[PDB]
Design a protein around this ligand. Structure first.
Ligand SMILES: Nc1nc2c(ncn2[C@@H]2O[C@H](COP(=O)(O)OP(=O)(O)OP(=O)(O)O)[C@@H](O)[C@H]2O)c(=O)[nH]1
Ligand SMILES: CN[C@@H]1CCc2c(ccc(O)c2O)[C@H]1O
Lengths: 224, 329, 51, 285
């Protein structure tokens, strides 16, 4: 008799609480920080200012980053509703092959069935070390990666010796070749060049997330 | 160390000699059950995000579900009104459980920790740690001992009073995805990612038998009500019925029109109907004995990840990524 | 490697029964308990709590 | 004779299409929960307005045109005129609201969720409908709009002829409130949207052009063109026939007014082409 009314009141209270929680849920934007082993993941996170969570806001916008921590990845189906993916790779480890493993990992991530609508932000760390080995060493990418001989810088791209820029563009285009192969217009990639001392990473992520949401909304209305 | 091949050949020869006639041969002449039509009776809403797990209560009245918004909600099926809402420390949960006594609720996820809550006091009671990987499933064996399986190819039996592992089960190669307990709560099985299902002994703590019918990862498993058989589901769109005493499979359920995976498997009270959920946003109802379809449970806009049948077998509940739960009768 | 070798010998020494007996037992159980499942047999609306 | 006959068949076909499209859209929205989005409340309000107009005012107008004599009382003449004005002036502000919603969605992605909520949408729709009905029923049911000319006096006196005669003030006010004000908003909003789309396309081309504005131009072109073509000539002849006496004949006025009514038969063909709507229509007949 009265138990039904008491249960109704409890249901009303629970619904009132859930309605208030929904707003704070919808406000935040989630990200996944996925990088290869030994690829500078620790620094980029540390110098910004079994699992790890990070809270930070830019211009009154809440972001929430997750670092996972298995060669096989069965848990990746749980990350199909994130805003973007931050991929961290060491650009200077082409001889220690670590770079080829990173390329295969990126290819596996891109063409997954459950990640059909997730964009990837690419960070190319260790610019100083790559430049040092490119300019001051007898070893050349040519040996490690053979095709390097044919590629010549894109005429349009900005730039420094004429060899370091060529190497960086070769690496970036080796990634963009996989990037532009499939996926139609559902998701994109935004390559970036980053060193340890760089301080603008938090602004770059903000801009990229804004562009991602803008492009999704534009595509939804048959305008792009 | 070439004797290992000799033992495997011995096992294969014994299994081949054991078989006399197919299951379909014996059960061919029984009458079919005909078309079975099911209609939605209740719809439960209130979850902000997708659902991964659920478990009916032992009284066939209360059920619990866990979503990725980081919240456990205990429903009331009869009057479609909530009772409890428990926030979580971490927002990633992959499993849930309901104690047989109706007093405790457990949940664990991507963090390598199994948590236990005290409904009748709602604050955390214990935190069981020691696994090195994400948890996949957990079942209350009693009010003070719980068995769990994690992603590090191991299973453990815990003690809630002290929070320390009592027995550890090892032997698998790939990740463990599910487990279920026997009707007498003396044995339990497990399905791994190496396409192999094993049968353990809780008291002894040593593996007993192994079945290797499938060709891909196993995502679900459940016992027959009799207690001498169990059926699994895999990524190759096949459900196979094994048997403990004979020690080989008897029947496979497959169709040419399905190429998707399987996420849940359950039986009916009489064991005549086998219910499975697929990635095609709908569930199928199979015939256990004659291996023939008898109905479809459609109505979900996204994939189905959970499914369970009440102890009294009065209804079946399905959960999906569309953040909804439905009760079918 | 001897640990793995021991298990293979251990699992081999179990008595087994023919498929016919197991299939007959399953069919007998399913036919015996067939009259006590609301899913298979549509019960009257009087006893159904979801209507 | 034959002309009278023919007019009928096409008028009945127009009525049937206007009713059928709107009722199908409403049924599809109501039946399925996958379409119960915030943006779909404005669309269902527009669909209800178009359905009400097509079901109420078109048949009686057709009967008046064909029989050349109105067979109901003065009260029903005023009632029909009021419903016509209300529906016409409520079927455009909803399109303005939709344009503003798309503007906010595209230009400010980080604040779209907070700005628009299921609670505020009802307030906006109620405000639009109230302000629409305030300019239709209030000055028509009462006799402010009535004119004092020699023809108008006989028209209001007789119980068989129900024509539209108005003074300058009411016509100008109604036209400005209904059409001219909700046009500059559309133009500004869609100009900004097109500029943003062009900027995004240029960014993509500069980013990954080597390995790899038509759709946006076509979409904005059809959306603006159908509405402007349908409703622009009428809202110019409306002003100019009051500015100058005997400048424009009544027959072309009625023809342009009827051209305006065709617009309600195209909104389902414009705002409801999404894959979800297509699947819903395929499932439901
Ligand atoms: N000179 C230089 N050293 C760098 C730069 N970025 C990273 N390092 C070095 O790389 C080391 C950290 O990278 P790793 O240890 O490979 O990886 P981590 O970031 O520590 O952790 P994981 O990324 O999770 O493996 C530090 O000791 C840094 O000194 C850079 O831009 N310049
Ligand atoms: C009888 N037909 C009416 C006459 C004038 C008028 C219409 C519609 C909207 C207006 O703002 C109007 O002033 C027409 O539908």
């Amino acid at each position: 008799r009265n138990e039904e009314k008491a249960q109704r009141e409890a249901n009303k209270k629970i619904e009132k609480q859930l309605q208030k929680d929904k707003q704070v849920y919808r406000a935040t934007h989630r990200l996944l920080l996925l990088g290869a082993g030994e690829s500078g993941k620790s620094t980029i996170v540390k110098q910004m200012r079994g699992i790890f969570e990070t809270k930070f806001q830019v211009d009154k916008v809440n972001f929430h980053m997750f670092d996972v921590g298995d060669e096989r990845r069965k848990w990746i189906q749980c990350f199909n509703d994130v805003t973007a993916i931050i991929f961290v790779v060491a650009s200077s480890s082409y001889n220690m092959n670590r770079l080829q493993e990173a390329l295969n990992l990126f290819k596996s991530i891109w063409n997954n069935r459950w990640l059909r609508t997730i964009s990837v932000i690419l960070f190319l760390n260790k610019q100083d070390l790559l430049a040092e080995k490119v300019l001051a060493g007898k070893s050349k990418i040519e040996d490690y990666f053979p095709e390097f001989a044919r590629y010549t810088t894109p005429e349009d791209a900005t730039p420094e010796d004429p060899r370091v820029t060529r190497a960086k563009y070769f690496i970036r285009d080796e990634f963009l070749r996989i990037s532009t192969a499939s996926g139609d217009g559902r998701h994109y990639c935004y390559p970036h060049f980053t060193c340890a001392v760089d301080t603008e990473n938090i602004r770059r992520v903000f801009n990229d997330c804004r562009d991602i949401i803008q492009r999704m909304h534009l595509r939804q209305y048959e305008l792009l | 160390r070439q004797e290992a091949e000799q033992l495997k050949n011995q096992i294969r020869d014994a299994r081949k000699a054991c078989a006399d006639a197919t299951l379909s041969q014996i059960t061919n002449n029984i009458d079919p059950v005909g078309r079975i039509q099911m209609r939605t009776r209740r719809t439960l809403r209130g979850h902000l995000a997708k659902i991964y797990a659920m478990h009916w209560g032992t009284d066939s009245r209360l059920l619990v579900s866990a979503s990725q918004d980081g919240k456990l909600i205990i429903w009331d099926s009869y009057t479609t009104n909530k009772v409890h809402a428990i926030p979580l420390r971490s927002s990633w949960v992959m499993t849930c459980a309901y104690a047989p006594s109706g007093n405790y609720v457990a949940c664990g996820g991507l963090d390598n920790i199994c948590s236990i809550y005290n409904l009748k006091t709602v604050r955390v009671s214990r935190e069981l740690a020691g696994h090195t990987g994400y948890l996949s499933c957990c079942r209350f064996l009693d009010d003070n001992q719980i068995v769990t399986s994690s992603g590090d190819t191991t299973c453990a039996l815990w003690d809630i009073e002290t929070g320390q592992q009592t027995t550890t089960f090892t032997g698998h190669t790939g990740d463990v995805m599910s487990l279920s307990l026997a009707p007498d709560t003396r044995l339990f099985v497990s399905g791994a990612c190496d396409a192999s299902a094993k049968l353990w002994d809780v008291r002894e703590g040593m593996c007993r038998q192994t079945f290797t019918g499938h060709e891909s990862d196993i995502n679900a498993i459940c016992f027959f009500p009799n207690g001498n058989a169990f059926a699994t589901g895999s990524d190759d769109a096949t459900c196979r019925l094994f048997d403990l005493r004979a020690d080989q499979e008897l029947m496979t359920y497959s169709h040419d029109n399905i190429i998707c995976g399987i996420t849940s498997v359950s039986f009916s009270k009489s064991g005549r109907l086998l219910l499975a959920g697929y990635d095609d946003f709908n569930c199928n109802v199979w015939d256990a004995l004659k291996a023939d379809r008898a109905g479809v449970l459609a109505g979900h806009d996204n994939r189905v990840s959970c499914l369970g049948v009440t102890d009294d077998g009065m209804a079946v509940a399905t959960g999906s990524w569309d953040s909804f739960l439905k009760i079918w009768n | 490697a001897r640990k793995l070798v021991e298990q293979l010998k251990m699992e081999a020494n179990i008595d087994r029964i023919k498929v016919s007996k197991a299939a007959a037992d399953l069919m007998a159980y399913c036919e015996a308990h067939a009259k006590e499942d609301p899913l298979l047999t549509p019960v009257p609306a009087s006893e159904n709590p979801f209507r | 004779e034959v002309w009278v006959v023919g007019m009928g068949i096409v008028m009945s076909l127009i009525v049937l299409a206007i009713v059928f499209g709107n009722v199908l859209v409403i049924t599809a929205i109501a039946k399925f929960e996958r379409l119960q989005t915030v943006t779909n409340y404005f669309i269902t309000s527009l669909a209800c307005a178009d359905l009400v107009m097509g079901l109420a005012v078109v048949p009686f107008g057709a009967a008046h045109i064909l029989t050349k004599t109105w067979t109901f009382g003065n009260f029903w003449c005023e009632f029909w005129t009021s419903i016509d004005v209300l529906c016409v002036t409520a079927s455009i502000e909803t399109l303005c609201v939709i344009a503003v919603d798309r503007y906010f969605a595209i230009t400010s992605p980080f604040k779209y969720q907070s700005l628009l909520t299921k609670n505020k949408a009802r307030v906006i729709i109620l405000m639009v409908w109230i302000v629409s009905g305030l300019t239709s029923f209030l000055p028509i049911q009462m006799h402010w709009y009535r004119a004092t000319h020699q023809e108008a006096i006989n028209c209001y006196a007789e119980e068989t002829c129900c024509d539209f005669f108005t003074n300058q003030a009411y016509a100008i006010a109604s036209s400005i409130v209904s059409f001219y004000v909700p046009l500059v908003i559309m133009v500004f909003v869609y100009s900004r949207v097109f500029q943003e789309a062009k900027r995004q396309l240029q960014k993509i081309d500069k980013s990954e052009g080597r390995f790899h504005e038509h759709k946006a131009l076509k979409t904005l072109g059809i959306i603006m063109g159908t509405f402007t073509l349908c409703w622009l000539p009428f809202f110019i002849v409306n002003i100019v026939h009051v500015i100058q006496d005997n400048l424009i004949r009544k027959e072309v006025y009625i023809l342009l007014n009827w051209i305006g009514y065709v617009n309600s038969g195209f909104n389902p063909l414009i705002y409801c082409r999404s894959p979800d709507f297509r699947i819903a229509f395929q499932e439901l007949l």
